[PDB]
Design a protein around this ligand. Structure first.
Ligand code: PC1
Ligand code: 3PE
Ligand code: 3PE
Ligand code: 3PE
Ligand code: LMT
Ligand code: I49
Ligand code: SF4
Ligand code: SF4
Ligand code: SF4
Lengths: 154, 99, 69, 176, 144, 308, 376
């Protein structure tokens, strides 16, 4: 029986990591490098990562740029409308911890004050390749998930 | 019977796919007036009236078999021209505008 | 390369070929190896019902020739 | 000097008027657009096969920081704090004292990698090539805390990457 | 020309050592090109080049199936490339470490490690300085 | 036996739709100097399976609807009608041989708009109901020319039986005498299916329900292009080798469907009022004039087709 | 009247299809850059300018560097000036590609974005090779540039430039004569010459309306007076003409880049004044004076004589300037950033009168708005 549960986890994990549909908050500079990840050289679509997805068909939110206090409530609302399972990738110093505006009166010091974060991509900005490395790292995180194995043991 | 079986299968399968879509183990333990233009209403009515004239034109492939071809062609062209006339009337009366 | 688009096109093409191929072969199976009779008008239906009676087995697609004269 | 982008008068000769009518009715310029996208269908794509293939970089690339050593193994950093002073983001925090052998060395060298803007000013300011931005760009983490580097982490980065870092410095130091 | 195109396709099956080896690289790397082997590192990664490919596709690595006790048959990672080959693979230099080896130092890691985030070997930050203020310790014996 | 036949039509349609999503992504990719899916299975061949499973285990997060009944009804109507459009298609033989198959498809396609309208009601959102009404207005408008164009073509064919279109085109494709109609027909099908450059529902603007609306819409895309092939690019039928018809007929449909992808990759989007003008002020005048012409043409050439 | 409600919040009043009022709500990317700059040395403040119009990085750097050099009363060496014009025009190509193809993608034409972003990727390589960063290079600095070009870079810029005009041609084939593209842009967002001036427009927002003005011609800086190029001028002041001006400006940028490559002179790359520009590392490690000056430039920074200057360049999006106030110390007292998009977006309501909702997307696109510079 546990053999069945192990293989269904593999199946659903494979499907979810193989069809990661992102919503990008293109907040600032870092949005440019995610555009270069979609561009032909890296072609995120070839991994199953569609270029643009609506928030309600999205699986991963990519916070790409500085999150201000004025924008923080809007970002939380979009996260709360994401169907589950949902993941958050924080990309760039600004989103990671405030970066170069960390000491500003108007900047949230890291988007993890507003939403939970699964992957932190460092850089100002991270290169398109560095972002792609972070996306592939999120895929490996999903591969490790054991939702049914843990469900069967409750 | 064949066609009813086809229709039943198509919509029964549609019903099944919709319900299984709505159901799955989630593994969890925890009347007024729209602010919408009168122009959009006029599109619907215009479609309706033209749709009624298309109904009158559908028999034309069969009507072309008649021996009264002179009458058939005159009435066929008459109906289309009047349909064109109503389009011309709407056009000139600013009825196909959106500004 | 562009010819890496073909495998997906081939699968979709095979999928769209089965309905036409299946219907044609199911018709032959069910009609004694012939095309399914088309009866769009009452005259064609009348002959099809007459064939059913003449067939002797209640199948309009079983044909009787001069052997039965 | 200037030029007009869109100041032209269409010819009204019947041959030209009919040319525009054919374009309107036969959609010729729309067909011409179809040819361009068709020609791309048969071009080789620009995509590379990451992570088996990598985008090209130069020796100047500014990646993950590391602290370096002299060939003997002694740390290059002498706790001068010029990197900390110039850092545009105040991402560097340093403390220092005399080492047991009396050497001038740091007891704290932290870089908040989520404050850092990866500008390279620290490695420009360093007088002994101690702090560098290395070539690594694939160090994303699962937690915020993992990006708060202390001296042990930065020294480990230097020992991990020195082979590449030294060769990159060798290729670019004559431009500095 | 179409016939010549097809034979090149078949030479990739043989260039990869037969049908099984052809399918292994197809499913591991999504690519069946055959290149010149430039070298191999101590972890089993193999490095290839084909200079007729456009810049960026002219160098690639086929990752080892095991590294530091981790099964990497399907789970490959860009951080698996050791620093000596990192420079060549990213075109920071022209010649590989087999032709211009890196300068040896005693303190340089002999064993490369890939990204360890999310494992029990992940880095955990902490303050590296000692306590600054020393508290007074009261005497052990009684005397009020 | 007939039950087997129904399933051998329904199931291949769903698989064809699933792999159309792969083909569209890869065709768009290469016209954009990239590859599109090529990791999930060889050449992306498992990408549609991954997407389908992922969508069906996603949280069916629907905010409260105005009416539960119409929330379920809208996608059932959409998918059910879409599968129903296929049963009269001669490929070369139809599942159901209808004497009025052409009129049957027109009737069934005119009901497809209800799924749009009911979605607007069930969204419980004023703004989603407005988008649904804008979509309905576009759809019914382009229904007008599709009906008239189809009528004009049938005047050279002689009946509403779909298989008679095969006989009509035994010597010659109908695209040759009717290329002006084929042009407007083809654009009308794009506007009818909300395809670029007419994809204004997306421009202006989950889980399984979303996947079902998507599947129905992509099944309509394939079916419209099959109907275009039958209507204008008639394949010759050899009664002793029906598979030869099916092969050639399928190729024409694939190329026509791929041209929808081609057109999406090539053009910007119409403004809403501009695609309304394209129909009411351009297509409809020509369609009316060409309908008059095609009523007169068989009579003045003594080329009236047989009634049977 | 139905009311609807980087990133932007648009509050609009609609009567049917027509926009009756358009009220942009910005500040969603306001990060108090100007206040932060007051706590930085002049060098420390330079990287902030990469992150304003973060599509035109070295043009923002040039504007700040020119302002500081003016207050310092120094000038960069000639080779630094030619490099700065060379990479200024490469940066204009980066911006115009982003402006035109995302303007196209926003209204459905998604394919040119992919073709031209492969070209952007190759230009990102030129930034990375001179500075080690693909975008925020921090390369252009007061006194000149940080480092000299690596050997073999100009040859590769020539190779890229030699083929680029064909890429522009492919873009024009997709858009210029397309009746759908023209329907979306012709007679959209018409702005009169006098309204454009009074509303504070600049750049292509002016030239699209026939105004003959370009700071590279009228008020030249660095070595722009030594290169030949034409200024494209519009005739209708609408989105389509501004689109044509931007496409033609890309062609003229290649024309300027060709001259920069051929006329690049030898010599040093930063001003030979170690009280402003740091000495070479080899000098820093041998000469006592050089080490002192390196130490002081990287801690206190150079002091700037007290004064104020408004300094402007012809950035890819329009006039970009700084009002920079020095109090005599090594930290600026006040730095006001004049972003061309600030005034342009302030005129969206005026431009969108009598248009439909879907045209507002086109008008925002023709203004070329990056909210890094609008919000600062
Ligand atoms: C309904 C039935 C659909 C079956 C789907 C099977 C998908 C095949 C597959 O999992 O790919 C092999 C995958 C491919 O490996 P991968 O997903 O780790 O990717 C490795 C290749 N690169 C590096 C290019 C990404 O194998 C696995 O990952 C193991 C999980 C198997 C999941 C299926 C369980 C049965
Ligand atoms: C002996 C005498 C015999 C008598 C009969 C003679 C008849 C022959 C003469 C008639 C020829 C008419 C051709 C009919 C086609 C429709 C023409 C048409 O409608 O074009 C006008 C329309 C709008 O054009 P526009 O620039 O906006 O200006 C007009 C309004 N001011 O333009 C458009 O429709 C643009 C469409 C936009 C969508 C573009 C996407 C499609 C592009 C690729 C299509 C490829 C063609 C497909 C072929 C069909 C495939 C089956
Ligand atoms: C929305 C759900 C889908 C709606 C379904 C509506 C069905 C309409 C199909 C009518 C098409 C038609 O006329 O042909 C089907 C068949 C007759 O076929 P036909 O060839 O035209 O005539 C027989 C021989 N001459 O006609 C028949 O087989 C007779 C069927 C009679 C029962 C119809 C019940 C319809 C109820 C729908 C609600
Ligand atoms: C062949 C020789 C005869 C040539 C006849 C040419 C007459 C053309 C009339 C005309 O020029 O009308 C155009 C104009 C509508 O265009 P518009 O752009 O609104 O006017 C300028 C403002 N921009 O004025 C209009 O209002 C359009 C005319 C009214 C619409 C008539 C539609 C014709 C009927 C449609 C069916 C076609 C004919 C029968 C089939
Ligand atoms: C096409 C046929 C495919 C057959 C595959 C059959 C596999 C059946 C196993 C399904 C496992 C689903 O796994 C589960 O999916 C639901 C989708 O909402 C997720 O979401 C669920 O849990 C989260 C919290 O964890 C809740 O907030 C949420 O309301 C709930 O929907 C779960 O986080 C995920 O653990
Ligand atoms: N629209 C595309 N071409 N794909 C895409 N980007 N999203 C849609 C992907 C999709 C949706 C439903 C199913 I069922 C499947 Cl198999 C795949
Ligand atoms: S992390 Fe760097 S590149 Fe990204 S938004 Fe912040 S300053 Fe810009
Ligand atoms: S790279 Fe720049 S921001 Fe980062 S630590 Fe060095 S000086 Fe500070
Ligand atoms: S790293 Fe260099 S600049 Fe920083 S304190 Fe050490 S020696 Fe000084």
């Amino acid at each position: 029986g546990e053999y069945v549960v192990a293989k269904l986890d593999d199946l659903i994990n494979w499907a979810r990591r193989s069809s990661l549909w992102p919503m990008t908050f293109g907040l600032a500079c870092c949005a440019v490098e995610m555009m270069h990840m979609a561009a032909p050289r890296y072609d995120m679509d070839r991994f199953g990562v569609v270029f643009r997805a609506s928030p309600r068909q999205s699986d991963v939110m990519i916070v790409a740029g500085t999150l201000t206090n004025k924008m923080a409530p809007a970002l939380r609302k979009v996260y709360d409308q994401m169907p589950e399972p949902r993941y958050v990738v924080s990309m760039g110093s600004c989103a990671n911890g405030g970066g170069y505006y960390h000491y500003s009166y108007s900047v949230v010091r890291g988007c993890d004050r507003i939403v939970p974060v699964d992957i932190y991509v460092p850089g100002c900005p991270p290169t398109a390749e560095a972002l792609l490395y972070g996306i592939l790292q999120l895929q490996k995180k999903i591969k490790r998930e054991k939702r049914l194995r843990i469900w069967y043991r409750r | 019977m064949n066609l009813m079986l086809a229709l039943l299968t198509n919509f029964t399968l549609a019903t099944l796919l919709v319900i299984i879509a709505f159901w799955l183990p989630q593994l969890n333990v925890y009347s007024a007036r729209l602010p919408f233009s009168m122009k959009f209403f006029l599109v619907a009515i215009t479609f309706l009236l033209f749709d009624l004239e298309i109904a009158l034109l559908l028999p034309l492939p069969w009507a072309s078999q008649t021996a009264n071809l002179n009458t058939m062609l005159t009435m066929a062209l008459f109906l289309i021209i009047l349909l064109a006339v109503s389009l011309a009337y709407e056009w000139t009366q600013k009825g196909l505008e959106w500004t | 390369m562009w010819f890496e688009v073909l495998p997906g096109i081939a699968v979709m093409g095979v999928c769209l070929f089965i309905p036409g191929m299946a219907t044609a072969r199911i018709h032959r199976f069910s009609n004694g190896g012939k095309e399914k009779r088309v009866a769009h008008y009452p005259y064609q239906w009348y002959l099809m019902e007459r064939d059913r009676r003449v067939s002797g087995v209640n199948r309009s697609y079983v044909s009787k020739g001069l052997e039965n004269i | 000097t200037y030029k007009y982008v869109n100041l032209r008068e269409p010819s009204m000769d019947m041959k030209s008027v009919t040319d525009r009518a054919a374009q309107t009715l036969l959609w010729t310029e729309l067909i011409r657009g179809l040819g361009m996208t068709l020609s791309y269908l048969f071009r080789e794509p620009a995509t590379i096969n990451y992570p088996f293939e990598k985008g090209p970089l130069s020796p100047r690339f500014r990646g993950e920081h590391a602290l370096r050593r002299y060939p003997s193994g002694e740390e290059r950093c002498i706790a001068c704090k010029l990197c900390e002073a110039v850092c545009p983001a105040q991402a560097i925090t340093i403390e220092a004292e005399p080492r047991a052998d009396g050497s001038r060395r740091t007891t704290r060298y932290d870089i908040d990698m989520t404050k850092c803007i990866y500008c390279g000013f620290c490695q420009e300011a360093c007088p002994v090539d101690a702090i560098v931005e290395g070539p690594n760009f694939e160090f994303s983490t699962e937690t915020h805390e993992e990006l708060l580097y202390n001296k042990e982490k930065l020294l480990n980065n230097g020992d991990k990457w020195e082979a590449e870092i030294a060769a990159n410095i060798q290729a670019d130091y004559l431009y500095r | 020309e179409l016939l010549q195109v097809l034979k090149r396709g078949l030479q990739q099956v043989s260039g990869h050592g037969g049908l099984r080896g052809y399918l292994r690289v197809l499913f591991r790397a999504n690519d069946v090109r055959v290149g010149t082997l430039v070298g191999e590192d101590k972890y089993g990664n193999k490095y290839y080049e084909d200079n007729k490919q456009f810049f960026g596709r002219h160098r690639w690595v086929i990752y080892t199936t095991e590294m530091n006790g981790k099964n990497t048959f399907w789970d490959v990672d860009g951080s698996m490339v050791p620093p000596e080959w990192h420079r060549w693979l990213h075109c920071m230099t022209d010649d590989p470490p087999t032709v211009k080896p890196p300068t040896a130092r005693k303190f340089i890691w002999t064993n490369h490690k890939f990204n360890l985030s999310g494992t029990p070997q992940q880095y955990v930050p902490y303050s590296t300085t000692r306590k600054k203020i020393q508290e007074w310790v009261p005497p052990s014996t009684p005397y009020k | 036996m007939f039950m087997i036949n129904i399933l051998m039509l329904i199931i291949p349609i769903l698989l064809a739709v699933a792999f159309l999503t792969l083909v569209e992504r890869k065709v768009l990719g290469y016209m954009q100097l990239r590859k599109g899916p090529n990791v999930v299975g060889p050449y992306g061949l498992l990408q549609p399976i991954a997407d389908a499973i992922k969508l069906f285990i996603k949280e069916p997060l629907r905010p409260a609807t105005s009416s539960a009944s119409m929330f379920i009804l809208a996608p059932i109507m959409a998918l059910g009608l879409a599968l129903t459009m296929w049963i009269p298609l001669p490929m070369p033989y139809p599942l159901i041989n209808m004497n009025l198959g052409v009129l049957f498809m027109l009737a069934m396609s005119s009901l497809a708009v209800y799924s749009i309208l009911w979605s607007g009601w069930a969204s419980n959102s004023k703004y989603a109901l407005i988008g649904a009404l804008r979509a309905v207005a576009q759809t019914i408008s382009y229904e007008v020319t599709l009906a008239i164009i189809l009528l004009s073509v049938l005047l050279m064919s002689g009946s509403f039986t779909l298989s008679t279109l095969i006989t009509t085109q035994e010597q010659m494709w109908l695209i040759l005498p009717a290329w002006p109609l084929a042009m407007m027909w083809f654009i009308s099908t794009l506007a009818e299916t909300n395809r670029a450059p007419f994809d204004l529902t997306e421009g202006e603007s989950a889980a399984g329900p979303f996947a079902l609306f998507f599947m129905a819409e992509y099944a309509n895309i394939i079916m419209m292009n099959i109907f275009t092939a039958i209507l204008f690019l008639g394949t010759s039928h050899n009664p002793h080798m029906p598979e030869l018809y099916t092969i050639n007929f399928t190729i024409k449909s694939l190329l026509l469907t791929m041209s929808f992808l081609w057109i999406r990759a090539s053009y910007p989007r119409f403004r809403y009022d501009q695609l309304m003008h394209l129909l009411w002020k351009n297509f409809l005048p020509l369609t009316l004039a060409l309908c008059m012409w095609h009523v007169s043409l068989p009579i003045l050439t003594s080329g009236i087709p047989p009634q049977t | 009247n139905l009311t609807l409600n980087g990133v932007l919040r648009l509050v609009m009043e609609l009567s049917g299809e027509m926009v009756r009022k358009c009220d942009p709500h910005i500040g969603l990317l306001h990060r108090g850059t100007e206040k932060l700059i007051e706590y930085k040395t002049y060098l420390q403040a330079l990287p902030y300018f990469d992150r304003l119009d973060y599509v035109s990085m070295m043009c923002n750097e040039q504007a700040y560097s020119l302002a500081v050099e003016k207050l310092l009363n120094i000038r960069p060496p000639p080779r630094a000036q030619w490099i700065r014009v060379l990479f200024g025009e490469i940066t204009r190509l980066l911006n115009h590609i982003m402006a035109v193809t995302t303007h196209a993608l926003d209204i459905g034409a998604m394919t040119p974005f992919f073709w031209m972003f492969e070209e952007r990727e190759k230009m990102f390589e030129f930034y990375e090779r001179v500075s080690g960063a693909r975008m925020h290079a921090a390369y252009v600095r007061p006194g000149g540039v940080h480092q000299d070009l690596p050997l073999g870079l100009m040859d590769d810029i020539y190779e890229f430039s030699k083929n680029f005009s064909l890429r522009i041609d492919e873009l024009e084939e997709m858009l210029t004569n397309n009746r759908i593209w023209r329907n979306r842009t012709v007679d959209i967002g018409i702005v009169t010459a006098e309204d454009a001036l009074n509303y504070g427009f600049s750049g292509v927002m002016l030239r699209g309306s026939g105004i003959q003005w370009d700071l590279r011609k009228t008020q030249p800086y660095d070595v722009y007076d030594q290169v030949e190029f034409d200024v494209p001028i519009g005739s209708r002041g609408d989105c389509y003409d501004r689109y044509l001006c931007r496409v033609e400006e890309m062609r003229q940028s290649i024309r300027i880049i060709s001259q920069c490559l051929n006329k690049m002179p030898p010599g040093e790359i930063k001003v030979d004044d170690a009280k402003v520009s740091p000495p070479k590392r080899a000098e820093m490690k041998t000469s006592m004076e050089s080490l002192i000056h390196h130490f002081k430039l990287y801690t206190e920074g150079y002091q700037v004589p007290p004064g104020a200057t408004y300094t402007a360049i012809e950035a890819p999006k329009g006039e970009f300037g700084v009002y920079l106030v020095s109090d005599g110390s090594s930290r600026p007292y006040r730095c006001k950033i004049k972003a061309p998009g600030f005034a342009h977006l302030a005129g969206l309501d005026k431009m969108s009168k009598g248009h439909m909702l879907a045209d507002v997307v086109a008008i925002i696109g023709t203004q070329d708005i990056v909210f890094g510079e609008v919000d600062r």
